[PDB]
Design a protein around this ligand. Sequence first.
Ligand SMILES: Cc1cccc(C)c1-n1c(=O)c2cc(C(=O)C3=C(O)CCCC3=O)ccc2n(C)c1=O
Ligand SMILES: Cc1cccc(C)c1-n1c(=O)c2cc(C(=O)C3=C(O)CCCC3=O)ccc2n(C)c1=O
Ligand SMILES: [Co+2]
Ligand SMILES: [Co+2]
Lengths: 380, 380
Amino acid sequence: KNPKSDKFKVKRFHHIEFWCGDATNVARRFSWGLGMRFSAKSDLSTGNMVHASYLLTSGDLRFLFTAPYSPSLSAGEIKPTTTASIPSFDHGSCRSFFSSHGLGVRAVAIEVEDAESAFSISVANGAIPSSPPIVLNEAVTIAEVKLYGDVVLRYVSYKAEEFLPGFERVEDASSFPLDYGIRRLDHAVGNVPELGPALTYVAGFTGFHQFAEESGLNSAVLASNDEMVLLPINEPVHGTKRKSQIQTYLEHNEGAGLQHLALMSEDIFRTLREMRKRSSIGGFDFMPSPPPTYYQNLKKRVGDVLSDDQIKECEELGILVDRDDQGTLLQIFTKPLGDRPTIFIEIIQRVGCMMYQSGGCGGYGKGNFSELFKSIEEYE
Amino acid sequence: KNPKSDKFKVKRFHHIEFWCGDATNVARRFSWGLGMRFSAKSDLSTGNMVHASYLLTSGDLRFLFTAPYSPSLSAGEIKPTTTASIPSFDHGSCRSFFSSHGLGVRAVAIEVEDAESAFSISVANGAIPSSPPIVLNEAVTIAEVKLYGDVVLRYVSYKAEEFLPGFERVEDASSFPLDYGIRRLDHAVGNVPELGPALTYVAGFTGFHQFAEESGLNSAVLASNDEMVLLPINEPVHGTKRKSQIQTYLEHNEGAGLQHLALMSEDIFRTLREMRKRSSIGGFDFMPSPPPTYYQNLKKRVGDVLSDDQIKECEELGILVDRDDQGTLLQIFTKPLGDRPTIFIEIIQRVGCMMYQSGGCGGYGKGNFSELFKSIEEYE
Ligand SMILES: Cc1cccc(C)c1-n1c(=O)c2cc(C(=O)C3=C(O)CCCC3=O)ccc2n(C)c1=O
Ligand SMILES: Cc1cccc(C)c1-n1c(=O)c2cc(C(=O)C3=C(O)CCCC3=O)ccc2n(C)c1=O
Ligand SMILES: [Co+2]
Ligand SMILES: [Co+2]
């Protein structure tokens, strides 16, 4: 059941912004590791004396990396005269965020019809304001409300139907056309100490509905009207055999924040071949693969969806498979993206639910908790 | 003339430590960009609850990348019970350094016969102490004094004749044997507001001597007895046509600090081929190449050292050539390593001065200031 109760018109995920100590090194590492092209910049070379921001793209996926310059460079500016291209940016906020949490996601940005209306309606319905609507070059409006922890939900609306005003398209020489098949953000997942209050807050100001659904967590998924914006949230379950990875997250992150980004691939086998080639030469590492029994047991579970060759290729790449009543999910998880055992990435591809493909087809892999534990003891 | 006035026995450069916001992403970027292998680690997986430190090596070159964890992880520790593998590390110091300067070099480490003696003699001769000698596992002694700005000169001495106690050798699977030919640190260069006082201070506590020698700078080089540890220092020259790059450094760095690391290659043509292949896929960019007139004029200057083919290969890779009375220098400079126009890297190879090769053979490229300006107007 989908009551379609969005309190304002939401379109799709627009971008994810990481707050960094050095945006250049994180952006270059991510570009190589994920196969994303350098698409736009806002920095000293574009007149921005406040922050360095670099945009990577792969298909419709947009990753922004931002770091502060010395405040001395902009000490004469005031907000009316700022050279920042993202007017919500604040040196103190960014340094405090990075000191507290390490490298991680500051903003989950969604495109809406009217960011000023979305902001007003959100705050009227309980959202804690973070940055009020600001119109950039009479062309784009951006506004921010608190989502959880120090993560904001950023509203972006466009008059037209680039990236942001003040960003420039990087030079072709500096823009190598990397592409490992990643195409869009499927979902963005938060970790909180208490699920109930978090859900009530976010669903309260968005009108997002709950998407139709002992391993250390309880979870729920909030979804927009067409279920294309998907925001799962996890809480820990205490007193378990193995320590909850949600609680480890909260400890090392200094509280709530974004846990993982799930990136849809048009060909998860190519994406994983390309990412695994680069794991030890600057890219990303993946979690340890499941035992071979897990892949033996895939025949009974998804033998009607994947061939034996396609199953065998899942086995060499360490890909996980889950299935609901509507579709099938291929997924795999990276090791944490930086120093702390906090944020990681999920690569996914969904099969089924053809109408375009409806959102969340195949679920989120919750069935892989039981299948992994089963396969663990089976191969033992 | 070399008075050989070292006040304690100095051997060679040992390592360079970068202070980072996220050590993982900087280390992975540098590994791919420079062709250095992951060699050792000290982090949560080795019991270090204080800092994450990753060591990259290429030949004898050692780059260490360190970032702080949340202080909450080690809140119960005191210095006698610390899990830090580098006992000089301090969360506040590291966050303050990175907030002030951005990504950059905290420590220039040299190996000495006795780090405790070097520390005592240095401080007796004017060195400002930074971290007193500490013996690690009865095997290694480390001590630190201020060099310039917030950069320290780190003394390391070994009883035996790994890396540091508490570091572990990374797994083979995570240790890809990258190698683009870089073999050791040739020199490490500081930028200061006033050269005179800086030289007097450092030469005062080390006994290092001045090495035998309008473009925006004055410089001088301090050298150990065998001239294998080389520490040039630059000051700006104000009121020039083009703004001094030393003054730009000081402004964006918030004062004095390390300007560049010069890395000796055993084959600069292979190193630059490999680095330039990777510039736009996560590696390092190089400064704009000199005009073709510069390479036309190489025939008259170094036609007795480099063939026409070897000169032509300098031209395609953008390599610079200078010559003193003793040897010839091939060199090239990267663009800044991170967000700020501060630290960069020089790749060099020296030809001549065979005895082993004596230190500083061919100089530091000061002749390339005049040759570049000459070539600029010539090709105009
Ligand atoms: C990757 C890893 C590292 C260390 C410990 C553990 C438990 C894991 N880990 C996961 O985090 C994980 C996450 C999801 C997942 O994506 C997800 C959602 O997107 C929203 C609903 C809740 C949920 O589970 C699915 C399966 C998972 N599995 C199977 C897994 O093992
Ligand atoms: C790389 C760059 C970017 C923007 C502006 C400029 C001036 C430069 N730049 C250099 O920084 C540069 C540095 C050295 C050098 O290594 C060096 C030493 O190691 C110690 C003695 C002083 C000295 O000059 C030599 C030649 C150089 N040249 C030729 C050059 O153009
Ligand atoms: Co997921
Ligand atoms: Co140099």
